[PDB]
Design an enzyme around this catalytic site. Structure first.
Site, short mmCIF file in Angstrom:
data_model
loop_
_atom_site.label_atom_id
_atom_site.label_comp_id
_atom_site.label_asym_id
_atom_site.label_seq_id
_atom_site.Cartn_x
_atom_site.Cartn_y
_atom_site.Cartn_z
N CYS A 1 0.79 -1.23 0.00
CA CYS A 1 0.00 0.00 0.00
C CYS A 1 0.83 1.30 0.00
O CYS A 1 0.27 2.38 -0.12
CB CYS A 1 -0.97 -0.01 1.20
SG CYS A 1 -2.15 -1.44 1.23
N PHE B 1 -10.24 -5.45 3.29
CA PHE B 1 -9.65 -5.33 1.96
C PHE B 1 -10.74 -5.24 0.92
O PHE B 1 -11.65 -6.07 0.88
CB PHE B 1 -8.72 -6.52 1.64
CG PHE B 1 -7.45 -6.58 2.48
CD1 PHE B 1 -6.99 -5.48 3.18
CD2 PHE B 1 -6.74 -7.77 2.60
CE1 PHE B 1 -5.84 -5.55 3.96
CE2 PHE B 1 -5.59 -7.85 3.37
CZ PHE B 1 -5.14 -6.74 4.05
N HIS C 1 -3.94 7.31 3.42
CA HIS C 1 -4.22 5.93 3.07
C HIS C 1 -5.01 5.24 4.17
O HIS C 1 -4.52 5.12 5.29
CB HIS C 1 -2.94 5.12 2.81
CG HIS C 1 -3.21 3.65 2.66
ND1 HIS C 1 -3.92 3.13 1.60
CD2 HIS C 1 -2.92 2.61 3.47
CE1 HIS C 1 -4.03 1.82 1.75
NE2 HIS C 1 -3.43 1.48 2.88
N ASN D 1 -10.47 -0.88 2.18
CA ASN D 1 -9.06 -0.63 1.87
C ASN D 1 -8.71 -1.29 0.54
O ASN D 1 -8.51 -2.50 0.48
CB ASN D 1 -8.15 -1.16 3.00
CG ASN D 1 -6.65 -1.15 2.63
OD1 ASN D 1 -6.24 -0.62 1.60
ND2 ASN D 1 -5.84 -1.74 3.49
#
Lengths: 392, 392
Positions: free
Chosen positions: B167, B217, B306, B339
């Site tokens: 990431c 995720f 993020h 995410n």
């Protein structure tokens, strides 16, 4: 526009003047040397295929025509006995292969890098960027991260990690290094290639491309330091200057080179027409690259040609009409090391600077001023890099 | 020095004036929407684990605390029935997963890219560079090559393909785009992230990190066009300007995030201390980045953070002492998409420009002038990117 004034200060500060240069080159290989004359005997024994004598004769003929004298290989008999599934075609062996590679890739990379850093002569803390290119060993964090800790680089080093792409990466990663070096004053890039072919080892098949690979792929690592505006107040010295980088996907050739990462390791598909396809395109690629500098005589250049196979070097020699000794350094590396993937061209670059010094040539480029480096990979991708030598 | 005069002409020609800018952003997601409230029921049924009710309650508590409302996922019930080994923990399934990803990664990338190119408004032939970042789908040739043919980019487009890193790649690939754009006059970079988490799908385990991932995720693609010196003679218009990029490996945290590519797919190890570690380091990272511009009030910046997990956003909010609404756009993307790896920050950037226009703010950065984008990944790697908004 208050803020854009602050930004322009930053931009002004970062400007460079000259082209990216390679300041140093270091290389390394796995310990075990395999001579081509003995490899067929080794290969067919260690895979328990001595009951296929006809296939073995077909392999020997490929090896004998390869113009490879020897290779350094990470895969040994001990590794194959410890991981027998590497010898059973299509048997699950990815986990075993990765275990073997995840530590070894950054390790051999360090050996090459240390030699490069030694030649360069500057402190580790001056390395601002690290680019790591590796055919195999996909892992998170990657080999770039491992190498940074093995070497003791600053935690703020800017990193780029590129896995599993193929032999065009030599020229391609050089292009990325060039952009970094030229856009950032003071930047010094550590560029590392480490290509271990362990994932491509399989029991011998009746497939010309698999046998070729099994005969020609070798292992090696090369490291370079790349930077613009060499500092006279230190022992920094350019070997070559990087003038331009170009890349081209040859139309209609997507299927020429394919490789899939699978449970059995790397599954390769490689067309035997690749060398002819390269030979057909090489002159146009060369002309586009060096015509802007008024060059039209191909023999006035020095050459670094990715040694994918001996047929490739022949096709380049023939379609550019080169004199017979023009590709000596490229053939030399193919002979002494085999095809080591992306690292290969920099072994050749290293070899060329050394042979030139040894022979008393007046430049690092066999006495010549202008030169070209070629990389060839999937699918088909060709890299064309114009170089300037340095006087000696 | 005749030759170095020719080189200096080339270098002079390539100079740019302003900073790299993002000229456009487009995003895309897999078709199937999974609401967080229903995912535990779906997940434990489709993996035949309804006989583990205690583990399911432990999963529901993680999902309910996640601040994720919904996600778009490539993995569907149909895919799991067609590939049952994805549901059997540690069973060999890498070949099945890659088959599913090798075409889908470049495909979703195209959807995002087309939207970006549409906003940009310039011809495909003006795209000089392509950078493709993908968590999974390792293949040769790569997704960059596939995308180039899907879109019909020039065969001479300069490509960079980066697989399986994590990431931090949002900020990191932006740094590479910035260097390309600023070192090459006329360069226009197509930057594509496509992150499909299929390789991380496994039968539920009594592991807090695996369950978290399974809960949080999500899948998505984002594409940007990046370039310096926007051309007034066309409809090109900057959204944000990229002032500086910085990267840091936080010492002592190598083992915080590890992921291994194996026969069973991706094997993940992720420390629950990651959000605290980020919170401990964030202020120093911010200060080093924006102190050169005289900024010391953290609430005067706009933020793209993020969204690794809700704890991460909380730790950033708390340790920078941000007002309660500062991270709205970041929380919004976590809520609506989960995410999505490296693509996430650019979903947030997209969301921020749209919300700002919709609310009548005077800049694309929530009315503010200076801003910062943060990426967090292995191990631990932190990206810090200073941005300038554009007036509206």
């Amino acid at each position: 526009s208050f803020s854009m004034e602050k930004v322009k200060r930053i931009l002004d500060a970062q400007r460079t003047e000259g082209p990216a240069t390679v300041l140093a080159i270091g290389t390394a290989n796995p310990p075990t040397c395999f001579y081509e004359a003995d490899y067929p005997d080794f290969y067919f024994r260690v895979t328990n295929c001595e009951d296929k004598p006809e296939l073995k004769e077909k392999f020997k003929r490929i090896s004998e025509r390869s113009a490879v004298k020897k290779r350094y290989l990470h895969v040994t008999e001990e590794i194959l006995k410890e991981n027998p599934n590497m010898c059973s075609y299509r048997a699950p062996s990815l986990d075993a292969r990765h275990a073997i590679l995840v530590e070894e890739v950054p390790k051999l990379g360090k050996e090459a890098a240390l030699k490069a850093i030694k030649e360069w002569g500057q402190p580790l803390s001056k390395i601002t960027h690290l680019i790591f290119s590796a055919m195999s060993g996909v892992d998170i964090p990657g080999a770039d991260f491992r190498l940074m800790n093995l070497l003791g680089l600053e935690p703020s080093v800017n990193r780029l990690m590129i896995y599993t792409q193929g032999c065009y990466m030599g020229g391609a990663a050089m292009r990325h290094a060039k952009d970094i070096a030229e856009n950032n004053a003071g930047a010094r890039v550590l560029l590392v290639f480490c290509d271990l072919m362990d994932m491509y080892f399989h029991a011998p098949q009746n497939r010309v491309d698999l046998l070729y690979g099994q005969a020609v792929f070798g292992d090696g690592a090369a490291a370079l330091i790349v930077g613009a505006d060499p500092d006279d107040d230190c022992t920094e010295r350019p070997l070559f200057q990087v003038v331009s980088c170009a890349e081209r996907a040859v139309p209609g050739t997507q299927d020429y080179i394919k490789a899939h990462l699978k449970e059995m390791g790397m599954e390769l598909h490689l067309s035997t027409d690749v060398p002819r396809m390269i030979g057909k395109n090489i002159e146009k690629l060369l002309a586009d690259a060096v015509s802007p500098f008024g060059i039209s005589d191909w023999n006035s250049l020095f050459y670094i040609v990715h040694p994918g196979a001996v047929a490739i070097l022949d096709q380049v020699e023939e379609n550019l009409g080169l004199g017979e000794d023009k590709l000596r350094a490229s053939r030399y590396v193919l002979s002494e090391y085999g095809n080591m993937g992306a690292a290969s061209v920099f072994f050749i670059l290293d070899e060329m600077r050394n042979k030139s010094a040894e022979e008393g040539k007046l430049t690092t480029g066999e006495g010549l001023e202008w030169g070209v480096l070629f990389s060839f990979g999937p699918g088909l991708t060709v890299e064309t890099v114009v170089l300037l030598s340095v006087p000696l």
